[PDB]
Design an enzyme around this catalytic site. Structure first.
Site, mmCIF file in Angstrom:
data_model
loop_
_atom_site.group_PDB
_atom_site.id
_atom_site.type_symbol
_atom_site.label_atom_id
_atom_site.label_comp_id
_atom_site.label_asym_id
_atom_site.label_seq_id
_atom_site.Cartn_x
_atom_site.Cartn_y
_atom_site.Cartn_z
ATOM 1 N N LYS A 1 -14.721 -5.724 -10.440
ATOM 2 C CA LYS A 1 -13.842 -4.595 -10.747
ATOM 3 C C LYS A 1 -13.510 -3.920 -9.429
ATOM 4 O O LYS A 1 -14.346 -3.204 -8.863
ATOM 5 C CB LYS A 1 -14.506 -3.634 -11.727
ATOM 6 C CG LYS A 1 -13.772 -2.330 -12.011
ATOM 7 C CD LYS A 1 -14.672 -1.570 -12.982
ATOM 8 C CE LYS A 1 -14.437 -0.079 -13.021
ATOM 9 N NZ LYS A 1 -15.531 0.530 -13.817
ATOM 10 N N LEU B 1 -8.185 -10.216 -15.242
ATOM 11 C CA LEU B 1 -8.505 -9.961 -16.638
ATOM 12 C C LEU B 1 -7.894 -8.674 -17.176
ATOM 13 O O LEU B 1 -8.167 -8.313 -18.325
ATOM 14 C CB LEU B 1 -10.019 -9.909 -16.817
ATOM 15 C CG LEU B 1 -10.657 -11.164 -16.266
ATOM 16 C CD1 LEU B 1 -12.152 -11.221 -16.575
ATOM 17 C CD2 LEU B 1 -9.900 -12.376 -16.851
ATOM 18 N N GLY B 2 -7.083 -7.972 -16.392
ATOM 19 C CA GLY B 2 -6.473 -6.743 -16.865
ATOM 20 C C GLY B 2 -6.605 -5.698 -15.787
ATOM 21 O O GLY B 2 -7.561 -5.684 -15.017
ATOM 22 N N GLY C 1 -5.797 -1.347 -14.664
ATOM 23 C CA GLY C 1 -5.975 -0.029 -15.229
ATOM 24 C C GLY C 1 -5.517 1.041 -14.264
ATOM 25 O O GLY C 1 -4.901 0.757 -13.233
ATOM 26 N N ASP D 1 -15.777 8.336 -22.244
ATOM 27 C CA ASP D 1 -14.584 7.513 -22.456
ATOM 28 C C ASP D 1 -14.854 6.485 -23.542
ATOM 29 O O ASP D 1 -14.500 5.317 -23.414
ATOM 30 C CB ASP D 1 -14.121 6.842 -21.157
ATOM 31 C CG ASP D 1 -12.685 6.309 -21.237
ATOM 32 O OD1 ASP D 1 -11.819 7.047 -21.764
ATOM 33 O OD2 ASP D 1 -12.408 5.164 -20.763
ATOM 34 N N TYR E 1 -7.686 3.188 -12.767
ATOM 35 C CA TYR E 1 -8.745 3.336 -11.774
ATOM 36 C C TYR E 1 -9.164 2.032 -11.104
ATOM 37 O O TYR E 1 -9.884 2.081 -10.106
ATOM 38 C CB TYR E 1 -9.989 3.959 -12.421
ATOM 39 C CG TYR E 1 -9.719 5.249 -13.152
ATOM 40 C CD1 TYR E 1 -9.646 6.458 -12.466
ATOM 41 C CD2 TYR E 1 -9.521 5.260 -14.527
ATOM 42 C CE1 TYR E 1 -9.395 7.654 -13.133
ATOM 43 C CE2 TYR E 1 -9.267 6.449 -15.206
ATOM 44 C CZ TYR E 1 -9.205 7.647 -14.505
ATOM 45 O OH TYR E 1 -8.949 8.831 -15.181
HETATM 46 O O1 LIG Z 1 -15.457 -1.142 -16.208
HETATM 47 C C1 LIG Z 1 -16.531 -1.809 -16.505
HETATM 48 O O2 LIG Z 1 -17.693 -1.248 -16.423
HETATM 49 C C2 LIG Z 1 -16.419 -3.286 -16.982
HETATM 50 C C3 LIG Z 1 -17.569 -4.122 -17.015
HETATM 51 C C4 LIG Z 1 -17.445 -5.472 -17.457
HETATM 52 C C5 LIG Z 1 -16.140 -5.996 -17.868
HETATM 53 C C6 LIG Z 1 -15.014 -5.158 -17.827
HETATM 54 C C7 LIG Z 1 -15.159 -3.783 -17.379
HETATM 55 N N1 LIG Z 1 -13.712 -5.638 -18.229
HETATM 56 C C8 LIG Z 1 -13.527 -6.922 -18.673
HETATM 57 N N2 LIG Z 1 -12.184 -7.329 -19.060
HETATM 58 C C9 LIG Z 1 -10.956 -6.610 -18.644
HETATM 59 C C10 LIG Z 1 -10.032 -6.178 -19.843
HETATM 60 C C11 LIG Z 1 -10.788 -5.396 -20.919
HETATM 61 C C12 LIG Z 1 -11.116 -6.243 -22.154
HETATM 62 C C13 LIG Z 1 -10.758 -5.531 -23.494
HETATM 63 C C14 LIG Z 1 -11.992 -5.241 -24.398
HETATM 64 C C15 LIG Z 1 -11.650 -4.715 -25.790
HETATM 65 C C16 LIG Z 1 -12.603 -5.199 -26.907
HETATM 66 N N3 LIG Z 1 -12.720 -4.144 -27.949
HETATM 67 C C17 LIG Z 1 -12.190 -4.533 -29.299
HETATM 68 C C18 LIG Z 1 -13.100 -4.037 -30.460
HETATM 69 C C19 LIG Z 1 -13.400 -4.842 -31.586
HETATM 70 C C20 LIG Z 1 -14.237 -4.351 -32.647
HETATM 71 C C21 LIG Z 1 -14.824 -3.055 -32.617
HETATM 72 C C22 LIG Z 1 -15.715 -2.500 -33.698
HETATM 73 C C23 LIG Z 1 -16.691 -3.328 -34.308
HETATM 74 C C24 LIG Z 1 -17.532 -2.846 -35.337
HETATM 75 C C25 LIG Z 1 -17.434 -1.507 -35.781
HETATM 76 C C26 LIG Z 1 -16.484 -0.642 -35.203
HETATM 77 C C27 LIG Z 1 -15.634 -1.148 -34.191
HETATM 78 C C28 LIG Z 1 -14.482 -2.328 -31.469
HETATM 79 CL CL1 LIG Z 1 -15.143 -0.797 -31.370
HETATM 80 C C29 LIG Z 1 -13.657 -2.770 -30.411
HETATM 81 C C30 LIG Z 1 -14.650 -7.850 -18.749
HETATM 82 C C31 LIG Z 1 -14.468 -9.212 -19.202
HETATM 83 C C32 LIG Z 1 -15.611 -10.062 -19.253
HETATM 84 N N4 LIG Z 1 -16.874 -9.627 -18.877
HETATM 85 C C33 LIG Z 1 -17.060 -8.339 -18.441
HETATM 86 C C34 LIG Z 1 -15.942 -7.400 -18.355
#
Ligand SMILES: O=C(O)c1ccc2c(c1)nc(NCCCCCCCCNCc1ccc(-c3ccccc3)c(Cl)c1)c1ccncc12
Length: 330
Positions: free
Chosen positions: A66, A43-44, A46, A154, A48
């Site tokens: 992870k 899923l991606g 990084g 972060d 770390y």
């Molecule tokens: O490391 C850990 O603990 C951890 C724990 C669990 C998971 C994890 C890591 N990684 C996962 N995927 C790997 C890749 C990262 C995915 C990218 C996410 C970006 C979404 N972000 C856009 C956004 C859109 C809108 C807004 C916003 C809205 C309203 C107002 C202001 C802003 C704001 Cl702020 C932001 C994963 C997948 C499935 N299940 C669990 C996990």
């Protein structure tokens, strides 16, 4: 030397807790078996970690593994302890399990799964109500963890999962999170370049939860002005300059002067002199529907050089900008 600073909320939470709560270096981890879970896909990656979709063969449910890139045992203990301490908290990701491959013997963490929503569809049909709604959800996570004596350090978009269908948010990646202790001096090489608070950029180590509040200001800013990112710096030095071109130099030098910060000789020549711009210079046609005197007012109270004057998460939550989501949640 530099003037000391205390957090003005949750200052002493950790002191009044049993030593085990924050003495994570002595936390004894119980490693399950990574064969409980079958990796499905990546899923991606990084710096770390790398993250996989996996399924738990026992109950057949979707999960996320992870696999931690090699870092000091204690930095792993830290993240685990912090996840263990924050579990059940509003909109905190849930640590399900902690395992270690049998052959490679490499530690990993198993998280709950979140049906994340594509940001391409979540950055055009996002209404002014949706921005107030999810932002209020983030403050729930921030105020909880701060009240639990923890700073996240972060806060950035890639760390906020949103399930737009179910209107669910989860604050993730606690790799950098740390415990707040009055007087402690912290590593300023933290967070991502566009969401570093001025205190990291000027190397002022005695910071507190207020750091999380700046990063939020960066995100709100970039969403209502539809500028990603809002402060677009080439390095850590130019990042401060891009900030100064917006907040002004006069407040920056007062901040330096008040905490008796010693500023880098590199900065002695690039900051220059800049006025404090009114936020009206950033509103235009395409984004005027997201701007209002309430957002602007709330935004201006988050982005401040002086971390002591930034709104706390609990103060933010009471700001008029959220009056509608508070009413609708009843
Ligand atoms: O490391 C850990 O603990 C951890 C724990 C669990 C998971 C994890 C890591 N990684 C996962 N995927 C790997 C890749 C990262 C995915 C990218 C996410 C970006 C979404 N972000 C856009 C956004 C859109 C809108 C807004 C916003 C809205 C309203 C107002 C202001 C802003 C704001 Cl702020 C932001 C994963 C997948 C499935 N299940 C669990 C996990």
């Amino acid at each position: 030397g530099p003037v000391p600073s205390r957090a003005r909320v949750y200052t002493d939470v950790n002191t009044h807790r049993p030593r085990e709560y924050w003495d994570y270096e002595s936390h004894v981890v119980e490693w399950g078996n990574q064969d409980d879970y079958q990796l499905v896909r990546k899923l991606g990656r990084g710096k770390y970690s790398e993250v996989f979709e996996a399924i738990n063969i026992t109950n057949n449910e979707k999960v996320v593994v992870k696999i931690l890139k090699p870092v000091k045992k204690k930095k792993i203990k830290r993240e685990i302890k912090i996840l263990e301490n924050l579990r059940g908290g509003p909109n905190i990701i849930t640590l399900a399990d902690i395992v270690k491959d049998p052959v490679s013997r490499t530690p990993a963490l198993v998280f709950e799964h979140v049906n994340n929503t594509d940001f391409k569809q979540l950055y055009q049909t996002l209404t002014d109500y949706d921005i107030r709604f999810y932002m209020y959800e983030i403050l729930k996570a921030l105020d909880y963890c701060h009240s639990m004596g923890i700073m996240h350090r972060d806060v950035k978009p890639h760390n906020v999962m949103i399930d737009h269908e179910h209107r669910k948010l989860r604050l993730i990646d606690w790799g950098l999170a740390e415990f707040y202790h009055p007087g402690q001096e912290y590593n300023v090489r933290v967070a991502s370049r566009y969401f570093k608070g001025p205190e990291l950029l000027v190397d002022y180590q005695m910071y507190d939860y207020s750091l999380d509040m700046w990063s939020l200001g960066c995100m709100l800013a970039s969403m209502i002005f539809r500028k990603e990112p809002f402060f677009h710096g080439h390095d850590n030095y130019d990042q401060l300059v891009r900030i100064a071109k917006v907040l002004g130099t006069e407040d920056l030098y007062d901040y330096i002067d008040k905490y008796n910060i010693e500023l880098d000789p590199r900065f002695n020549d690039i900051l220059g002199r800049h006025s404090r711009k009114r936020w009206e210079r950033f509103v235009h046609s395409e984004n005027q529907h997201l701007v209002s005197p309430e957002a602007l007012d709330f935004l201006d109270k988050l982005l401040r050089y002086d971390h002591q004057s930034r709104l706390t998460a609990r103060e933010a939550m009471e700001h008029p900008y959220f009056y509608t989501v508070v009413k609708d949640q009843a």
